RNA sequence: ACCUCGAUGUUGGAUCAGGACAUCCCGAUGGUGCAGCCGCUAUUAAAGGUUCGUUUGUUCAACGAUUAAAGUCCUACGUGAU
């Protein structure tokens, strides 16, 4: 009762990691719909509290929530007090549910809006270079422009299905 | 015991043996044939 | 002079600190750092070390979901490596194409 | 990380190179008006 | 019955995908500690004529034994328990900025 | 977690006592998992400037297992500072003289070479046997799994497994053996 | 197998040879085309020193290795099994195959030192007092070179020297 | 308990009086030291478990001194023991079968002739002394040009090390 | 001819030495053309010891008497703010 590919159980006969069996894709496909519908049903009824959203702004990913501040090291050419929308959102999460973009969420699923509240120059930064025995010494001071944004609201819409 | 890098039997009675990490040549008939691997 | 040259070290040290924090949280879920970062790329989830380190500290439940996704994607690749392409690709192994 | 896998998918080895994450405008007005194009 | 991670310690993670496959849904409800996995709190801890008035038990100890006792109860080294000079005590910021 | 600010800070930066069983385990693998716990490398909130280290308790340090000929080949050398004070003892000699020296030196060489290294050694507890003081035993939390899985001796196999494993050859009946 | 017993009655010694039960090879080998019992069961490069079930079938009751012409193994696998048997006794995984002690001998109490993957005999090893420079380090052998081709499930190959 | 092999009994605390010659029947002049045991008592007993050591420790005192020249902690210790304070207190390692009740006096009859004993005491302090008298170095000649170097240690180390080894014989208190 | 030419003259001795072992002596052990004493040779061993004098600036050496032996070296050819 031994197959041609049979090996008796030894230390190296089987891989050290236990065998893993993936679910049936046909059976799992409808199982995903049940989970998505349940999570979508949590949005229409508003069964969520504070939401944290990961947005891509100024070549940077910010883990922001509502009513918080973020400092941006460049000028947006926007008057202070103007309300704008952050189009790129990569992740929106709650206490019980989390949605992932691939790599970005649709504009019909999440909306993050911020406000320009302060535009100021950076504190003086010292840029000095020195080389010994070469009379090489020069000092430069730069003040990069900065912009502060406050996240006002993070709202989602029931568009999962 | 004479230390030799290469151990060679000097008669039919010499026999090689592995002891204490290095090969030895023992010869009861000729005690001067004893060698230790260097 | 040290002030100017420390601006490169600060960027370097921040990323190294993030990797250790990401590695620490992955081991609590039975994963290694290469297994987490590598398998999140194949899911088109482009999250940098700064976010993952913050998620591993302030959003433990969200990080576990990412660990499960990376582990699931890791298992899908092994199953695809055993086959010769006859079986279809994994559910999470699909890639969204952009034109 | 993942540069080799991306090149096999027809994408850039660096995700900052091109694609929706980089090419798209980073912000827009709340009213819906499009933002001026970024310098990059 | 497949599960990428054991749903025993942190939460019950349920991976899912949308119809278009452009969004990954992660439903992770929090798990509650069962009642059977906990221990009860230890609530419990004559002919006397004179009331037991509070008696001071602050025994005098030298600098040596005082630090040795502290280094054993906090499992640290003796070096941190020695004082510092005025120069270092004046450089310390007594009004540091506070976040959150 | 809706905690107050002080209790929330205390819980995150709390110290957790771990247990290690060193019987039939390599000292280095014991030290590798003990190094991260002592430094706090197993926490996502880890940082060098924050004393986030924990307590590690290692029992049965007398019954450690050395791979290869490390009992005879490995040498632990130290110098007393006086002339002719250069002492070199093997692992076997050191183990008999001090049952906890081998594990202590392996862990001590893995911690960062800084002032915090001596502080982390204070939070490390070694016990040659399975006996543990009550105060140290009453505050343990988690027993970390052993890195190396102990192979089973030939007498520990049940008859079910012995009979399951097939014999590969048929010896002759006239062989004296 | 065959056993020899000597019984002396009336100052006369009688030597007899009595045949005992002999185990039989399990039927239906996975690979009947193999030449030696190792590859006949697809056990090549798939056993280690800790697999005492496989090693016990090629050893004598006193722990001695069996001859190659009797078991029928090939020259390559016989040496690999021979080294695994040596490392099995040194690791203490064969407590029922101890050497036969002659009458009137009581072994002294000796330091019980746990060890495994011991290439050389413990009594024939000298300590490494001078490690040497980094480019000329004196490494400590771990395991056995004859198991270099064993199936490794990890990307890093077996480290035979520490 | 009766005497058993491998047992150690307690000793005494004696006072060195002086020296006196002593002749044997063999005609050899042997010099002996008169050790006077006075006011020798056992102070306290510490069991092997409480000793944190292989042997059990026993406290012995000697040479009763004034009660006005001792600290409060020492005086109250003798108050409950009912003995005058002792000048020098030594600790002896004994076995379980050699325990002696505290307050028990001891006499010179504890030892017998023909028994070899070990005497421990502080040596005569000679203060700060040079290498010539402390370590026996030869020094330098008094004549033949020597300039301000007759009792000096000379070289203390080599130039390559650039340091002095610990334990090097240097002038100090002897 | 790389370092030292804006304060180490070098040698030897005196003083005190630390270290290597390729061991002069003490220890253990093979071989011997090893009877025994003496010897020769090889492995192991650096814990301890390794003299006093005449001429000579001497190092060295010569011979004087000895000793279980009077080892080979290195250390800024140790040590000269001793
Ligand atoms: K000078
Ligand atoms: Mg970088
Ligand atoms: Mg005096
Ligand atoms: Mg003189
Ligand atoms: Mg003068
Ligand atoms: Mg003078
Ligand atoms: Mg030698
Ligand atoms: Mg010189
Ligand atoms: Mg000189
Ligand atoms: Mg000088
Ligand atoms: Zn011969």
From Swiss-Prot, chain A:
| Presence of keyword Chaperone | no
Q: What is stated as this protein's family in its record?
A: Belongs to the bacterial ribosomal protein bL21 family.
Going by the entry's taxonomy, the superkingdom of the source organism is recorded as Eukaryota
> GO biological process annotations for this chain's record?
mitochondrial translation
Q: Which gene holds the coding sequence for this protein?
A: MRPL21
**What keyword terms does UniProt attach to this protein?**
Mitochondrion, Ribonucleoprotein, Ribosomal protein, Transit peptide
| Gene Ontology molecular function: any one | structural constituent of ribosome
Subcellular location, record wording: Mitochondrion
The GO cellular component terms are: mitochondrial inner membrane; mitochondrial large ribosomal subunit; mitochondrion
Section of the entire sequence shown: 45 to 205 of 205
Q: Does the keyword Ribonucleoprotein apply?
A: yes
Q: Which organism is it from?
A: Homo sapiens
**Quaternary structure annotation from Swiss-Prot or TrEMBL:** Component of the mitochondrial large ribosomal subunit (mt-LSU). Mature mammalian 55S mitochondrial ribosomes consist of a small (28S) and a large (39S) subunit. The 28S small subunit contains a 12S ribosomal RNA (12S mt-rRNA) and 30 different proteins. The 39S large subunit contains a 16S rRNA (16S mt-rRNA), a copy of mitochondrial valine transfer RNA (mt-tRNA(Val)), which plays an integral structural role, and 52 different proteins.
* Chief localization: mitochondrion
Q: What is this protein called?
A: Large ribosomal subunit protein bL21m
Curated annotation (Swiss-Prot), chain C:
Q: What biological processes does GO assign it?
A: mitochondrial translation
List localization entries: Mitochondrion
Cellular component GO terms, alphabetically? mitochondrial inner membrane; mitochondrial large ribosomal subunit; mitochondrial ribosome; mitochondrion
The keyword Ribonucleoprotein belongs to this UniProt entry's keyword annotation? yes
Q: Which family does it belong to?
A: Belongs to the bacterial ribosomal protein bL20 family.
Its quaternary structure?
Answer: Component of the mitochondrial large ribosomal subunit (mt-LSU). Mature mammalian 55S mitochondrial ribosomes consist of a small (28S) and a large (39S) subunit. The 28S small subunit contains a 12S ribosomal RNA (12S mt-rRNA) and 30 different proteins. The 39S large subunit contains a 16S rRNA (16S mt-rRNA), a copy of mitochondrial valine transfer RNA (mt-tRNA(Val)), which plays an integral structural role, and 52 different proteins. Interacts with OXA1L.
Q: Could you tell me what this protein is called?
A: Large ribosomal subunit protein bL20m
Q: What is the native source organism of this protein?
A: Homo sapiens
Lineage start: Eukaryota, Metazoa, Chordata, Craniata, Vertebrata
Q: Which gene encodes it?
A: MRPL20
Residues of the whole record sequence present: 51 to 149 of 149
From Swiss-Prot, chain D:
Localization annotation: Mitochondrion
Its lineage reads: Eukaryota, Metazoa, Chordata, Craniata, Vertebrata
Q: Which organism is it from?
A: Homo sapiens (Human)
Q: What is this protein called?
A: Large ribosomal subunit protein mL52
Source domain of life: Eukaryota
Tell me the protein family, please: Belongs to the mitochondrion-specific ribosomal protein mL52 family.
What subunit structure does UniProt give? Answer: Component of the mitochondrial large ribosomal subunit (mt-LSU). Mature mammalian 55S mitochondrial ribosomes consist of a small (28S) and a large (39S) subunit. The 28S small subunit contains a 12S ribosomal RNA (12S mt-rRNA) and 30 different proteins. The 39S large subunit contains a 16S rRNA (16S mt-rRNA), a copy of mitochondrial valine transfer RNA (mt-tRNA(Val)), which plays an integral structural role, and 52 different proteins. mL52 connects the central protuberance to the body of the ribosome.
UniProtKB/Swiss-Prot annotation, chain E:
Q: Might you report a single GO cellular component term?
A: mitochondrion
Which key words tag this protein in UniProt? Mitochondrion, Ribonucleoprotein, Ribosomal protein, Transit peptide
What's a single GO MF annotation on this record? structural constituent of ribosome
Taking the first listed entry, what is the main subcellular location of this protein, grouped into a coarse class? mitochondrion
Instruction: Describe the subunit structure.
Output: Component of the mitochondrial large ribosomal subunit (mt-LSU). Mature mammalian 55S mitochondrial ribosomes consist of a small (28S) and a large (39S) subunit. The 28S small subunit contains a 12S ribosomal RNA (12S mt-rRNA) and 30 different proteins. The 39S large subunit contains a 16S rRNA (16S mt-rRNA), a copy of mitochondrial valine transfer RNA (mt-tRNA(Val)), which plays an integral structural role, and 52 different proteins.
Region of the whole protein represented: 35 to 142 of 142
Task: Name the domain of life.
Answer: Eukaryota
- Entry protein name: Large ribosomal subunit protein mL42
Organism field: Homo sapiens (Human)
GO biological process terms held by the UniProt record: mitochondrial translation; translation
List localization entries.
Answer: Mitochondrion
Q: Which family does it belong to?
A: Belongs to the mitochondrion-specific ribosomal protein mL42 family.
């Amino acid at each position: 009762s031994y197959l041609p590919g049979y090996v008796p159980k030894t230390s190296l006969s089987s891989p050290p990691w236990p065998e893993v069996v993936l679910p049936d894709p046909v059976e799992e496909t409808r199982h995903h719909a049940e989970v998505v519908k349940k999570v979508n049903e949590m949005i229409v009824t508003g069964q969520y509290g504070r939401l944290f959203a990961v947005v891509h702004f100024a070549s940077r990913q910010w883990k922001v929530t509502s009513e918080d501040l973020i400092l941006i090291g460049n000028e947006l050419d926007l008057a202070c007090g103007e309300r704008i929308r952050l189009e790129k959102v990569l992740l929106v999460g709650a206490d019980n549910f989390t949605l992932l973009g691939k790599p970005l969420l649709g504009k019909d699923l999440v909306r993050v809006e911020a406000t320009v509240i302060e535009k100021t120059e950076s504190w003086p930064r010292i840029i000095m270079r020195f080389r010994k025995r070469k009379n090489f010494k020069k000092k430069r001071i730069v003040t990069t422009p900065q912009t502060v944004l406050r996240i006002n609201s993070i709202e989602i819409a029931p568009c999962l299905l | 015991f004479k230390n030799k890098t290469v151990l060679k039997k000097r008669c039919k009675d010499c026999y090689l043996v592995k002891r204490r990490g290095r090969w030895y040549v023992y010869c009861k008939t000729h005690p001067r044939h004893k060698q230790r691997q260097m | 002079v040290k002030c100017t040259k420390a601006r490169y070290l600060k960027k370097k040290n921040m990323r190294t600190l993030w990797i250790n924090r990401i590695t620490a949280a992955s081991q609590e879920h039975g994963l290694k750092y290469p297994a987490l970062i590598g398998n999140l790329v194949k899911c088109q989830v482009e999250l940098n070390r700064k976010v993952l380190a913050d998620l591993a500290i302030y959003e433990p439940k969200t990080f576990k979901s990412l660990a499960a996704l990376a582990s699931r994607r890791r298992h899908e690749g092994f199953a695809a490596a055993l086959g010769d392409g006859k079986e279809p690709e994994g559910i999470f192994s699909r890639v969204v194409q952009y034109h | 990380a993942g540069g080799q896998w991306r090149l096999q998918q027809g994408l850039a080895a660096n995700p900052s190179g091109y694609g929706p994450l980089t090419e798209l405008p980073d912000w827009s007005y709340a009213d819906g008006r499009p933002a001026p194009p970024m310098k990059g | 019955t497949y599960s990428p991670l054991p749903d025993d310690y942190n939460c019950n993670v349920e991976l899912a995908l949308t119809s278009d496959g452009r969004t990954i849904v992660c439903y992770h409800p929090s798990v509650d500690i069962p009642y059977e996995h906990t221990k009860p709190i230890p609530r419990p801890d004559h002919d006397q004529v004179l009331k037991t008035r509070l008696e001071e038990k602050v025994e005098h100890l030298e600098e040596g034994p005082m630090i040795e006792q502290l280094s054993k109860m906090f499992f640290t080294t003796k070096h941190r328990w020695y004082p510092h000079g005025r120069y270092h005590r004046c450089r310390k910021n007594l009004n540091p900025p506070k976040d959150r | 977690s809706s905690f107050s600010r002080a209790p929330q800070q205390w819980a995150t930066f709390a110290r957790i006592w771990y247990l290690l069983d060193g019987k039939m385990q390599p000292p280095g693998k014991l030290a590798a998992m003990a190094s991260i716990r002592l430094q706090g490398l197993h926490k996502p909130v880890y940082h060098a400037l924050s004393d986030c280290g924990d307590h590690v308790v290692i029992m049965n340090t007398r019954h450690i297992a050395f791979s290869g000929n490390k009992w005879e080949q490995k040498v632990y050398s130290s110098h007393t500072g006086y002339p002719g004070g250069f002492r070199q003892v093997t692992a076997a000699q050191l183990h008999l003289r001090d049952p906890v020296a081998i594990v202590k030196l392996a862990i001590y060489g893995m911690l960062p070479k800084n002032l915090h290294r001596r502080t982390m050694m204070e939070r490390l507890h070694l016990f040659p046997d399975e006996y543990i003081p009550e105060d140290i035993l009453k505050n343990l939390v988690e027993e970390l799994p052993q890195p190396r899985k102990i192979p089973k001796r030939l007498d520990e196999y049940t008859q079910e497994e012995i009979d399951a494993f097939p014999r590969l050859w048929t010896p002759p009946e006239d062989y004296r053996l | 197998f065959r056993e020899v017993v000597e019984t002396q009655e009336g100052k006369t010694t009688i030597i007899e040879g009595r045949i005992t039960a002999t185990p039989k090879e399990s039927p239906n080998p996975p690979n009947p085309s193999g030449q030696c019992p190792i590859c006949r069961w697809n056990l090549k490069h798939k056993y280690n020193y800790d697999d005492v079930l496989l090693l016990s079938q090629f050893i004598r009751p006193h722990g001695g290795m069996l001859p190659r012409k009797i078991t029928g193994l090939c020259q390559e696998e016989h040496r690999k099994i021979e080294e695994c048997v040596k490392m099995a006794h040194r690791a203490g995984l064969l407590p029922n195959h101890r050497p036969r002690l002659p009458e009137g001998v009581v072994p002294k109490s000796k330091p019980q030192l746990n060890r495994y993957l011991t290439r050389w005999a413990p009594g024939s090893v000298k300590p490494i007092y001078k490690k040497g420079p980094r480019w000329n380090r004196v490494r400590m052998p771990v395991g056995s070179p004859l198991l270099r081709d064993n199936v490794c499930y990890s990307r890093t190959p077996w480290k035979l020297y520490h | 308990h009766p005497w058993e092999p491998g047992s150690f009994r307690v000793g005494l605390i004696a006072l060195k009086l002086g020296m006196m010659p002593l002749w044997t029947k063999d005609g050899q002049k042997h010099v002996v030291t008169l050790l006077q045991v006075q006011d020798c008592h056992v102070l306290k007993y510490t069991s092997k478990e409480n000793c944190n050591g292989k042997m059990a420790t026993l406290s012995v005192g000697g040479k009763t001194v004034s009660r006005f020249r001792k600290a409060t902690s020492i005086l109250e210790f003798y108050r409950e023991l009912g003995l005058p304070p002792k000048q020098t207190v030594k600790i002896f390692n004994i076995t379980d079968n050699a325990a002696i009740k505290p307050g028990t006096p001891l006499y010179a009859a504890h030892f017998r002739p023909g028994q070899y004993v070990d005497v421990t005491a502080k040596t005569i302090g000679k203060g700060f002394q040079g290498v010539m008298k402390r370590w026996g170095f030869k020094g330098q000649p008094a004549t033949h040009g020597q300039t301000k170097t007759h009792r000096r240690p000379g070289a203390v180390a080599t130039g390559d090390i650039g340091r002095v080894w610990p334990g090097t014989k240097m002038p100090g208190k002897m």
